[PDB]
Amino acid sequence: XXXXXXXXXXXXXXXXXXXXXXXXXXXXXXXXXXXXXXXXXXXXXXXXXXXXXXXXXXXXXXXXXXXXXXXXCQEKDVLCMFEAEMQWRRDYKVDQEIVNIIQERLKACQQREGESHRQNCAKELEQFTQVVKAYQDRYXXXXXXXXXXXXXXXXXXXXXXXXXXXXXX
């Protein structure tokens, strides 16, 4: 919900126009298995929900924001860098899972269209190219194992190459 893209609206309605035979055997079984064990499992789920009654709140995810970046903290010091290294690592763990959501958005694009797939969508493939390219050039993907000090050097390497290209052109 909300974060998931999902389909706009589901169609499909029963026609049953050609022939009689024995109607639709799948629809006849759909009404049969709805009361056979689908109704029994729904009654058992309702009985388990009623038996819960009192439940724990659980305050979900903790905040903890900013605490000064590694770029702001000039000169090497163990007391200052430690909290900056934790801040970068927490962002890197989130940025890994941001890609995974858009990855699952592309998974939804393949199924919910089926026949078209490549010809349609147009937004999910474009959003994937906007994030992955930003992830590849900024958040490691070339800077080996994760390090906060190496990321600042990687950001400076991209900035120096861009400034040399902009001044020439």
Partner: protein, 68 residues
């Protein structure tokens, strides 16, 4: 939640801690580097009370002799 109590330290620990261990570590590293810097200077020039070779005498004789 039951595993969090009497079996786990918590996220508050090792965040307030470890940084305390790093604070001692920073003091241990900087002073050892200062010790390597001080011994590099004190051995080359005899300025401080470190690596100083013993002298001959402070006081031996001052009384009037039968000299020429």
């Amino acid at each position: 939640r039951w595993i969090a109590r009497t079996f786990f330290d918590g996220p508050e620990k090792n965040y307030e801690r470890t940084m305390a261990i790093l604070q001692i570590e920073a003091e241990k590293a900087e002073l050892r580097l200062k010790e390597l810097e001080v011994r590099r200077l004190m051995r080359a020039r005899g300025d401080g009370p470190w690596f100083h070779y013993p002298t001959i005498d402070k006081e031996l004789i001052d009384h009037s002799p039968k000299a020429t």
